[PDB]
Specification:
homodimer, 128 residues, CBS-domain, 3-stranded mixed β-sheet, globular, structural genomics, unknown function, MJ0922, Methanocaldococcus jannaschii, structural genomics, southeast collaboratory for structural genomics
Chain lengths: 128, 129
């Protein structure tokens, strides 16, 4: 697993959200497309947070959101991310900090390049 | 300890919530969100696994208006459901998971549901090495 880097297994041109948009509409888009998380980015394409269907879903069904409420209101501030050149064992360790099902992947300059998941890692460990 | 040394029993989640075949698809979706779960094993009155539904797939079908008021779990569930025996190794879990399913229902000597092993639980085991 040493010779496998996050970039070889991550998912690439991923759908993202901006801080300004409605969290409910995002949840719906997520449902419609079978997406499980939305990294959130600024205009510079840096990663600023992440929302997931699991978490949005959990508060939504608790009536805690409105049609006005934005992604920016509800995203977690201390978003765990991983670098593209990191090894899979590294990804595994970073995920086991709570688990977390997905890390946003960033490049040299912390510009989003992809997402690594649960599944990607299982899919890879399967290959060996 | 290695992926071959470790029994599915040792790492699975127990006490899992389930769904009966006649439960409404909509209330089960709502239940799934309330409790942060992503797949409901569907069981019969004897705790035998008769299917599975996921949040991803229910959500997808609701938001696309594919289900009426009368749509039950039994109308929509995946039928030919893959389970793993609790005595098996994590490696067998892994393999059964690649052959886009995040979770396996786990059954005992007699195909009664004892728990669920997820991609998460496997990640948390591998991390220990």
């Amino acid at each position: 697993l040493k010779n496998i880097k996050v970039k070889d297994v991550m998912t690439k041109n991923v759908i993202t959200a901006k801080r300004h948009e409605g969290v409910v509409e995002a949840f719906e888009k997520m449902l419609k497309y079978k997406i499980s998380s939305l990294p959130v980015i600024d205009d510079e394409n840096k990663v600023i947070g992440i929302v997931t269907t699991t978490d949005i879903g959990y508060n939504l069904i608790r009536d805690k959101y409105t049609l006005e409420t934005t992604i920016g209101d509800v995203m977690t501030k201390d978003v765990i991310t991983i670098h593209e050149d990191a090894s899979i064992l590294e990804a595994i360790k970073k995920m086991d900090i709570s688990i977390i099902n997905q890390l946003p992947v960033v490049d040299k300059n912390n510009k989003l390049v992809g997402i690594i998941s649960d599944g990607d890692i299982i899919r890879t460990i399967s290959k060996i």
